[PDB]
Design a protein around this ligand. Structure first.
Ligand SMILES: [Mg+2]
Ligand SMILES: [Mg+2]
Lengths: 139, 138
């Protein structure tokens, strides 16, 4: 596939290792940055020239925040950047509000082990990789 | 001394991270990976494990999870060393888990080197607690 500069952002290092373990088989991926905090993510985002961001939803960093506020900030300040949300919060209202921000993918940590590789493969082909929130939201 | 390790976490990405961390440790031998407590307990006897790196919150209605599961493993597999790997930052839960006489805790919020340090302590015949744990415990 086309070569891709990836930044990964999660406040759990073991999750960051897990992303690297899953992506080490994929040669076209270049992990140009790893961050545990949204301040360090935003300060480094201009300097790295990244095509994709694999971001955690619940994260420390008071200056730029986390979740919806952070994704809203990133898309307004870094419009070329593609965002894959990696979260364990599968709440219908949070997933749908995240979907309304026009992001490229959501991967649940509760889901299948091959979802994060498959989401990057979908992004390369210009397609979406997201779970449906509305049915559970409506309940 | 070589040590067979089983790991238990209900997020596959966490299991991948634990394996990636344990690549660097050559006297560790990852011998099983499990996403629930039922599959863990059913496979525990046939694997000849010396150490178990286990998550606190997992699915499993048969043998339960957290403090119930740790208690089940210590009574039925007393030779097994248990390292608890949790994102729970509640002093009551961590103190209750420590009172079971487990070999070590690792916080998912803590330092990247805490899991390697836990195993290094365990190889020298000692228990381990991160600074993140000892700071919040009172
Ligand atoms: Mg988080
Ligand atoms: Mg869990």
């Amino acid at each position: 596939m086309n070569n891709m500069n990836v930044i990964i952002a999660d406040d759990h290092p073991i999750v960051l290792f897990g992303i690297r373990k899953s992506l080490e088989q994929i040669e076209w991926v270049n992990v140009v940055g790893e961050f545990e905090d949204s301040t360090a993510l935003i300060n480094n985002l201009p300097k790295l020239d990244a095509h994709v961001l694999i971001t955690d939803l619940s994260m420390p960093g008071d200056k730029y925040g986390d979740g919806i506020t952070l994704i809203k900030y990133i898309k307004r300040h870094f419009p070329s950047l593609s965002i894959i949300v990696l979260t364990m919060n599968n709440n219908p209202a949070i997933l749908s509000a995240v979907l309304d921000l026009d992001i490229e993918g959501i991967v649940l940590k509760q889901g299948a082990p091959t979802d994060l590789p498959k989401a990057l493969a979908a992004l390369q082909k210009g397609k979406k990789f997201t779970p449906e929130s509305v049915s559970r939201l409506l309940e």
